Structures are given as structure tokens and as C-alpha cells.
Design a protein around this motif. Sequence first.
Motif, PDB file in Angstrom:
ATOM      1  N   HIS A 161       0.849  -1.187   0.000  1.00  0.00           N
ATOM      2  CA  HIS A 161       0.000   0.000   0.000  1.00  0.00           C
ATOM      3  C   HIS A 161       0.884   1.235   0.000  1.00  0.00           C
TER       4      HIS A 161
ATOM      5  N   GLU B  47      -3.268   4.748  -3.595  1.00  0.00           N
ATOM      6  CA  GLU B  47      -4.284   5.646  -3.066  1.00  0.00           C
ATOM      7  C   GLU B  47      -3.839   7.087  -3.266  1.00  0.00           C
TER       8      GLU B  47
ATOM      9  N   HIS C  25       1.949   7.786   3.105  1.00  0.00           N
ATOM     10  CA  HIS C  25       2.192   6.643   3.974  1.00  0.00           C
ATOM     11  C   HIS C  25       2.351   5.384   3.141  1.00  0.00           C
TER      12      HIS C  25
HETATM   13 FE    FE Z   1      -4.309   4.558   3.181  1.00  0.00          FE
END
Ligand code: FE
Lengths: 126, 127
Positions: free
Chosen positions: A62, A118, B7
Motif C-alpha cells: 500500500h 491511493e 504513507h
Molecule cells: Fe491509506
Amino acid sequence: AVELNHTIVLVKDKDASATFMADLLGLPKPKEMGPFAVLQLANDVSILFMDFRGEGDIVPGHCAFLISDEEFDQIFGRIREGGIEHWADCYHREPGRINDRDGGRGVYFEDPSGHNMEIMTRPYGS
Amino acid sequence: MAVELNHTIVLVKDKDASATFMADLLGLPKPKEMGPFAVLQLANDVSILFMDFRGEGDIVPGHCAFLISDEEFDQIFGRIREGGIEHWADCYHREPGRINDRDGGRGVYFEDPSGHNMEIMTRPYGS
Ligand SMILES: [Fe+3]
Ligand SMILES: [Fe+3]
């Protein structure tokens, strides 16, 4: 102040994944550096895409990117025009939608190797 | 206009063990709990989200490299030495118990409890 300077992301094809991400995010073409295709982000951190040499499949990771409002319009525009599958949520239970968390806008998509990518316009938690 | 990496997830056997090891070693506050994550916040607007591995096999080791000041290197490497933390000058771990002098700076490699290849450096790669 301790900075995260770079991290490796294993993919089936480092050039395919780095170019897909650079094109979609509106960034310059990735730089080749040894066995890496380098995606430089603005906050002094780079993703080093590397060809997976193992035997099994890619373990999906991710990476989430914080972008401006105008960049969201441009990047999501490329998601829509390119027919890129996308989701509002990390678990991909809300396909074809964007989220409005934290007073911003966000959307999830995948690179060619299936990593959970994302974009977001506001920091998580406000 | 700026695309930032905000992140990324690092899978480990024990998110609390790995996040606390890294925070203690790097001189950072205790990690923050956020859902299934132990959050290690770095200074350049990016966080590492340590997450417990749910698969069956072993951890696939990754690589995280941290850029720090000269004074921070003395403090962090001091904790590496005082804690008996295994370290190497090189990414391939063929030079144990050494630090490198890449780019006129100083660098050293070590591992978290799950075996990820961690690195600190005082100068950016290539100068
Ligand atoms: Fe996230
Ligand atoms: Fe490195």
C-alpha cells in the motif's frame, strides 16, 4: 529530524509499474538507477520499483499519495478517461466511487502488479 | 502542485515490536496505534504503517532508508552500538560491524525484528 528517504516496491515489471504511476500521477518519467526504476515524490522520498525475482506472486503493498485539489482533478480525470478500475475504500468494497474523508477527496487504484495505490487531498484525520 | 508519498505499509510478525524497535532506535516518540497499524511518523510528511502479517509463510524483507543529520547519526549509531544491534556497512551484509562513508557522509544497515533491511545515511545518495 529523521526522514524516510527511499523504499523498495517489488513488482513484476519495474518499468511498467513506474511508468504507469508516473503517467497517472502527472510526474516526470521515472529514472533508471541500477536495478531500480525511481519514482521521486515531492517530500524528499522516492519509491524504488524493482523486478521481483522470487517464485510466487507479488505480495500487494500500500502506497498513499497526498496531492493538491487541482492534481486530484487531473489524476482522477486520467483514471476515468483511461478506464482504470478504482474504489473509494482500501478494501475495494465501494467500486467506481471516490471518498470525501477529512473534507477532501480520495480514491484507490492498482498498479499493474496489484499494489493498493491511493490518492488523497487532505491528511488523514483532518 | 506537489505529489507526496504520505504513507506506506510494512508487514511484520509483530507490528508493536517492530514499530517500537524503530522508534526507540531512531529517537522518535512511541508509535501511534491506528486500527491494525502501529504508526511510525517521519519528519518529511510520511509515515510507515507497521501491520501484522496474516499470511502463512515468512516475511518478504523490504528496504527502508532514512536520511538523518550528523548529530542524529551519532545518537542513533550510539544506540546501535550500546544495544548490540547487528549492523553492516553494505546492503548485502558482507561487511559486518562497519559503517560506510558513501557520498562523504556516513551510513549503516541493520534489521528490524522481522528482518527488513533498514538503512540510515547522513547524505543523499549521489551527493
Ligand atoms: Fe491509506
Ligand atoms: Fe538504500
